[PDB]
Design a protein around this ligand. Structure first.
Ligand SMILES: Cc1cc2nc3c(=O)[nH]c(=O)nc-3n(C[C@H](O)[C@H](O)[C@H](O)COP(=O)(O)OP(=O)(O)OC[C@H]3O[C@@H](n4cnc5c(N)ncnc54)[C@H](O)[C@@H]3O)c2cc1C
Ligand SMILES: Cc1cc2nc3c(=O)[nH]c(=O)nc-3n(C[C@H](O)[C@H](O)[C@H](O)COP(=O)(O)OP(=O)(O)OC[C@H]3O[C@@H](n4cnc5c(N)ncnc54)[C@H](O)[C@@H]3O)c2cc1C
Ligand SMILES: C[C@@H](c1ccc2nccn2c1)n1nnc2ncc(-c3cnn(C)c3)nc21
Ligand SMILES: C[C@@H](c1ccc2nccn2c1)n1nnc2ncc(-c3cnn(C)c3)nc21
Ligand SMILES: [Zn+2]
Ligand SMILES: [Zn+2]
Lengths: 227, 228
């Protein structure tokens, strides 16, 4: 089994850093093939621009990013950074995303990865989205840290249920491309939590990774996310 | 004399998004509003949250915490000039319009970068000082979004779910959290699939709405509004 970890934190000693390393350690220990895209260390280009196609653009007078990258994929003309990430995803049976929550979503660097890597022809098609997505057969999993407490992330809480913010990512992106989505790993409020609680959150993540291949995916539906 | 900031995120001036931005500029300018546009792609705005965003001595130089460092940087007036210039535009604005195509049920990463880097602690919010006590209280925000998906795809029964589901992180999680009152979103569904005559109608509808934009009340930005 082959695992891609897409990681988006600036600081290796971070709680996010620890969770990534524990995933590398434990998956490597089981005998999985492990790859890590450390996006900040790669200085990954997040912007969707014409630099993402290498050669003459199909319509040079009026640039349409969606249309041009789809044609570029079919012609094998995408920038090498995109195509290298596409190779890693194509080979991967499981893709883990490790990141701190930025404005109820992924950090922009990781948003850029999503925007640029998962292009038409590679991740989806028409037809070929949701259960018919082109990355069907693969598993995705969001491992997210938050500043907000668990109690803030409830239906009655001030931020709403944590499942509300997962919708664009799990359904809108991952399910749309054909991933089956495993339950998210949410490590609430490591900054506020005690060191002993932090250790428990890391141990729980380690523990889960031991049996990750036997898990069932969630039913990625409106009903799951919104009750 | 009302002041409008348009944060615009499309690569191509002749785009449908471009047209909507220009019509907003034209119509708001015609009313006598002060109009400013942050064209993010033309500015080549840095989207990445890195240590380059602080120009000064870091509170903890051995272990970098972006949140903690940018908060201290704001108080010390030590943020990168691109951040502080956008902060000035927002501080002056009475209304901030965001114009963008929907990218993966959200904003394009360039615009996500603007949100991550501009709306830092001390400027946009504080602890306490968020949601109704946010530091940008008194201001209005409005999302003008285009989609590839049809209106019918963006319903509760539809395959993408209700459009209000994807607005939650943006309107509540970001804008409300900073103290903006949120005006109803402008959603221009599926311009690529629509006929030219339908496209013209969608632009004219946006123009028409902007004529009376100052008499509108904000939505109640609640869980109940988005999910009820
Ligand atoms: C632009 C921006 C937007 C944000 N938006 C949101 C939002 O919308 N909603 C929200 O809830 N939050 C938000 N946050 C907060 C953010 O999600 C948290 O700060 C982040 O998730 C914390 O993760 P971290 O890895 O940086 O924690 P850290 O600060 O790195 O970790 C906390 C502590 O854990 C320690 N640690 C590391 N490894 C271990 C280990 N193995 N065992 C024990 N302890 C360890 C660290 O040394 C540190 O003391 C935002 C932050 C920023 C900068
Ligand atoms: C990375 C990526 C992710 C995406 N994710 C999503 C998603 O999650 N959900 C989703 O629904 N969609 C998604 N899309 C699709 C995207 O949202 C649409 O392609 C976009 O919203 C359409 O806006 P546009 O301005 O690019 O349209 P354009 O292609 O610019 O416009 C369509 C046509 O209108 C014409 N036009 C321009 N101005 C006028 C005018 N004044 N009058 C008449 N005609 C005019 C143009 O010439 C053009 O032929 C994604 C696209 C990309 C590239
Ligand atoms: C940090 C966390 C939070 C907010 C208030 C609070 N009072 C006691 C504990 N608290 C924790 N929080 N909860 N929702 C959030 N949304 C956004 C952010 C945020 C945005 N930028 N940064 C640096 C943090 N922080 C958020
Ligand atoms: C293309 C558009 C779409 C797909 C199917 C369909 N049938 C009738 C109209 N339709 C419109 N669409 N609908 N939801 C989408 N979500 C995402 C994307 C997309 C485009 N580029 N990328 C990278 C994602 N496109 C999307
Ligand atoms: Zn789903
Ligand atoms: Zn709200």
């Amino acid at each position: 089994k082959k695992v891609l970890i897409v990681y988006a934190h600036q600081e290796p000693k971070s709680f996010n850093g620890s969770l990534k390393n524990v995933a590398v350690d434990e998956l490597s220990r089981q005998g999985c093939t492990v790859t890590v895209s450390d996006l900040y260390a790669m200085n990954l280009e997040p912007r969707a621009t014409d630099k993402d196609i290498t050669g003459t653009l199909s319509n040079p007078e009026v640039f349409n990013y969606g249309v041009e990258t789809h044609e570029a994929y079919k012609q094998r003309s995408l920038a090498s950074d995109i195509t290298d990430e596409q190779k890693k995803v194509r080979e991967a049976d499981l893709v883990i995303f490790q990141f701190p929550l930025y404005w109820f979503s992924v950090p922009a660097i990781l948003k850029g990865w999503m925007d640029r890597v998962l292009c038409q022809g590679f991740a989806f098609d028409i037809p070929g989205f949701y259960d018919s997505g082109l990355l069907q057969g693969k598993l995705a999993l969001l491992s997210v840290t938050t500043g907000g407490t668990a109690e803030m992330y409830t239906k009655t809480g001030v931020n709403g249920d944590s499942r509300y913010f997962l919708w664009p990512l799990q359904h809108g992106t991952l399910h749309f491309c054909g991933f089956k989505v495993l339950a998210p790993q949410i490590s609430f409020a490591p900054e506020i939590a005690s060191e002993e609680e932090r250790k428990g959150m890391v141990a729980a993540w380690s523990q889960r990774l031991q049996t990750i291949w036997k898990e069932e995916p969630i039913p990625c539906t409106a009903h799951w996310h919104f009750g």
